[PDB]
Amino acid sequence: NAMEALKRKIEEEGVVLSDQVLKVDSFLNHQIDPLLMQRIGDEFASRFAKDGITKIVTIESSGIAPAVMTGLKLGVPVVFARKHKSLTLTDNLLTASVYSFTKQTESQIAVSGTHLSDQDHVLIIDDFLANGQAAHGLVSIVKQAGASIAGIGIVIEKSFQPGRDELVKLGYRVESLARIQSLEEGKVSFVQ
Amino acid sequence: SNAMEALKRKIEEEGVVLSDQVLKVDSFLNHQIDPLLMQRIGDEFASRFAKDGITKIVTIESSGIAPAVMTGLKLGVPVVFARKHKSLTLTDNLLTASVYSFTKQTESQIAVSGTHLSDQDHVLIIDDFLANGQAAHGLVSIVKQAGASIAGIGIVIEKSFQPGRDELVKLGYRVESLARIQSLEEGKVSFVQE
Amino acid sequence: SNAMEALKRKIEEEGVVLSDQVLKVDSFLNHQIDPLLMQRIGDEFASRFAKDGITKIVTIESSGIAPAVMTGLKLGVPVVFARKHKSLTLTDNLLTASVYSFTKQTESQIAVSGTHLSDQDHVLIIDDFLANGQAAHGLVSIVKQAGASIAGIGIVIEKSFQPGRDELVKLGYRVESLARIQSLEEGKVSFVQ
Amino acid sequence: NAMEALKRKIEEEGVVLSDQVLKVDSFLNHQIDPLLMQRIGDEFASRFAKDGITKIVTIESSGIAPAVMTGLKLGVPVVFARKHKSLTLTDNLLTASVYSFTKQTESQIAVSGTHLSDQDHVLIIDDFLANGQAAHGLVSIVKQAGASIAGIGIVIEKSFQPGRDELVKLGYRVESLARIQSLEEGKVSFVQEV
Ligand SMILES: Nc1nc2c(ncn2[C@@H]2O[C@H](COP(=O)(O)OP(=O)(O)O)[C@@H](OP(=O)(O)OP(=O)(O)O)[C@H]2O)c(=O)[nH]1
Ligand SMILES: Nc1nc2c(ncn2[C@@H]2O[C@H](COP(=O)(O)OP(=O)(O)O)[C@@H](OP(=O)(O)OP(=O)(O)O)[C@H]2O)c(=O)[nH]1
Ligand SMILES: Nc1nc2c(ncn2[C@@H]2O[C@H](COP(=O)(O)OP(=O)(O)O)[C@@H](OP(=O)(O)OP(=O)(O)O)[C@H]2O)c(=O)[nH]1
Ligand SMILES: Nc1nc2c(ncn2[C@@H]2O[C@H](COP(=O)(O)OP(=O)(O)O)[C@@H](OP(=O)(O)OP(=O)(O)O)[C@H]2O)c(=O)[nH]1
Ligand code: NA
Ligand code: NA
Ligand code: NA
Ligand code: NA
Ligand code: NA
Ligand code: NA
Ligand code: NA
Ligand code: NA
């Protein structure tokens, strides 16, 4: 299954930096493995195939590939939020502020309100879930449109960081394909 | 429909002309993505380069990623997207190129890690728009810096009245543009005569 | 004075010409509002349409609201203001229109709930400024989507050297502008005589 | 009177959407009943007729209509704060942050100090009072200008939410024309009157 394939790729090609950051630039965050992305998208679609999804929401840039493969299988469009000023993202903006615990800056992410309806049932897709600030921002943007959230699909979850618990506590269904329990001693340990 | 037909229909029906030089397609390419259209676009690119020995796709965040990934999926090759800003893990073996912005009137840097580009690679560059061509030239430079060859450049929407295409063709590169726009004057899209 | 002359004097005495083509009137129209002047403006609009069988006024947030509500008060009709952004309760039967900005070369969407526009409505559109006219075209479209008819368009300040007015008039719409500005060059406001 | 007319309108046309949301788009928040707005303004003016009001402060968009009718009766100007960048609100900006529980995100509202002096005795007018964050923002803006606050006039107050108590605790006179004790079980229940 996709989970096993992903876990294998992490153990084979991932590099643990400073027992804290998991570098997977060979297939997710810089180089993209399209076949693996398709398997990931088919797994997300499988979990939400009976939820009435109308639209997927993600955020540039690493989330786009898994989100688009998921939208392809479910047959729904994919909207990616913008982090920086863009040429054609100008008005009708739904925005949220994303605080970085790392560099200690608040930044703004934005989605055009014309692409989210009160009748939309949204699946949020993202590559990493760590502290979860962008995920909260996308939840806010979806709620600002009057739309409902079917759930949140995450490729890699760092389960020792509070992002997941924050979303689940608020009632959101979180579907993480790889759940990392620890990165200490320079190696990846998966949950259970 | 083939990819070109479906893309021209989407442009006609949903594209919005904002000026002589700007065509808004945020409903299916630049903010909302139509994944099925992207697959057809990727399959079309793969067909045109099916016999050319492609080993890797190179694109640039963010709008180029979706058409690039669909092309790599069909061809069965990896996809590398250059980054425009500093990122958490793009930290070593950096290949850099200066990209002049016409609005900002200054150069910004794009980067790819050489870890993912070999001198044995035969690269297909994929991007969403071709206008003044500065990003395309930067991606060409990065591929060359890696010692790799360039099979061609695949473009979803080309503005044929701007110099980007002619500059790449004059350098000898194969440019495959699925929608070629002759003009946006009068607030309407006019495609190159076929 | 009548409303037109009161408005022109206020423009001359408190308006500021920015970049020789933008008229700043934040002291009484676009940020601070002079309610008494607004009432006189509304009464004049009402006078010009007092025998067209107006059933409803349509405007757009935010600067159009005050003159529109004063017009609706005198004519005895409700006022509907279009929205430029998401609103908590704006969800049902939304009629939308695209508004292009020649100044910024961008496009935005405005919306009105169809629940508040009937095929039996005869609508007077009220707005604060008429320049390039794209918002006015958008409100016209929304009224037509509802099957209602347009009695005319009342404008507080018209920049007559810009094409908005001629576009609307060409299409047969009555445009009633209380202050018609012929020029803003030389940092002075010249009115159409 | 205006309170009776308002309660009737709420009873006849208000739609309860939730335990926390009352839809009144038919006369206050989208379609406006100007005559009712007049009644509301005259009532606000009556309650503050002897208090030396020099200016009304409100916030776009729903607050404008009741605020302007109030200023018309009292014979004073009305200033509406803005929530978004606008063409001519460019200098002497007095700003306040406003948090939304509904949104879980913050927002900025602004007034130009050119239209507020330390000579001003301000009546704040708004359409709804719920959690009260926008009201506190307007209070902050008026205090930033060195002006005094005569009180806060509210068309519809949800008394079961903490907005009113916070302002009363800070010493402000809050005059609410309709006070809703509960929206439970899809019905509007008003605060008991003796
Ligand atoms: N590779 C990797 N990335 C991590 C890891 N932990 C967090 N990130 C990424 O760093 C960015 C910030 O995430 P957080 O770490 O939760 O935010 P924080 O700075 O407030 O803690 C995100 O990138 P992004 O916004 O998704 O960037 P982009 O890739 O889309 O440009 C996220 O995906 C990790 O262990 N490995
Ligand atoms: N929608 C639209 N975009 C155009 C058009 N022409 C150029 N662009 C986009 O603008 C960006 C380049 O901006 P400039 O620095 O002014 O370069 P330019 O002179 O070639 O336009 C590119 O975005 P990018 O780097 O691809 O950004 P992103 O979309 O990946 O974030 C390119 O795709 C057009 O007609 N319509
Ligand atoms: N003060 C002033 N404003 C002008 C002038 N010309 C245009 N505007 C205003 O600028 C805003 C945007 O106009 P555009 O849609 O770009 O097209 P326009 O310039 O032809 O109006 C409109 O405000 P709006 O949507 O009504 O904004 P709001 O005030 O309701 O927030 C319009 O009223 C001018 O000379 N002076
Ligand atoms: N219809 C309705 N609206 C409510 C109710 N409670 C609060 N609001 C409105 O929702 C908007 C946002 O409120 P918030 O900033 O989230 O504060 P809140 O937590 O008290 O709602 C405000 O509109 P605003 O800024 O005045 O919006 P606008 O209408 O001026 O655009 C406020 O008037 C309610 O029960 N019914
Ligand atoms: Na991400
Ligand atoms: Na990431
Ligand atoms: Na691009
Ligand atoms: Na682009
Ligand atoms: Na206006
Ligand atoms: Na205006
Ligand atoms: Na309000
Ligand atoms: Na409100």
List the helices and strands and how they pair.
The structure is a homotetramer.
Chain A: H1 2-13, E1 15-17, E2 21-23, E3 31-32, H2 34-48, E4 55-59, H3 64-74, E5 78-81, E6 93-99, E7 106-112, E8 121-129, H4 133-144, E9 148-158, H5 163-169, E10 174-182, E11 189-190
Parallel strand pairs in A: 4-5, 4-8, 8-9, 9-10
Antiparallel strand pairs in A: 1-2, 6-7, 10-11
The structure holds guanosine-5',3'-tetraphosphate (4 copies) and sodium ion (NA) (8 copies).
One sodium ion is lined by residues 60, 63-64, 127-129, 135 of chain C.
What can you tell me about this protein's structure?
- 4 copies of one chain form a homotetramer.
- Chain A has 192 residues and is an alpha/beta fold.
- Helix content of chain A is 30%, strand content 32%.
- The first copy, chain A, has a 6-stranded mixed β-sheet with strand order 5-4-8-9-10-11, with helices on both faces.
- The first copy, chain A, is globular.
- The first copy, chain A, starts with a helix and ends with a strand.
- Chains in contact: A-B, A-C, A-D, B-C, C-D.
- At the C-D interface, strand 3, helix 2, helix 3 and strand 5 of C face strand 3, helix 2, helix 3 and strand 5 of D.
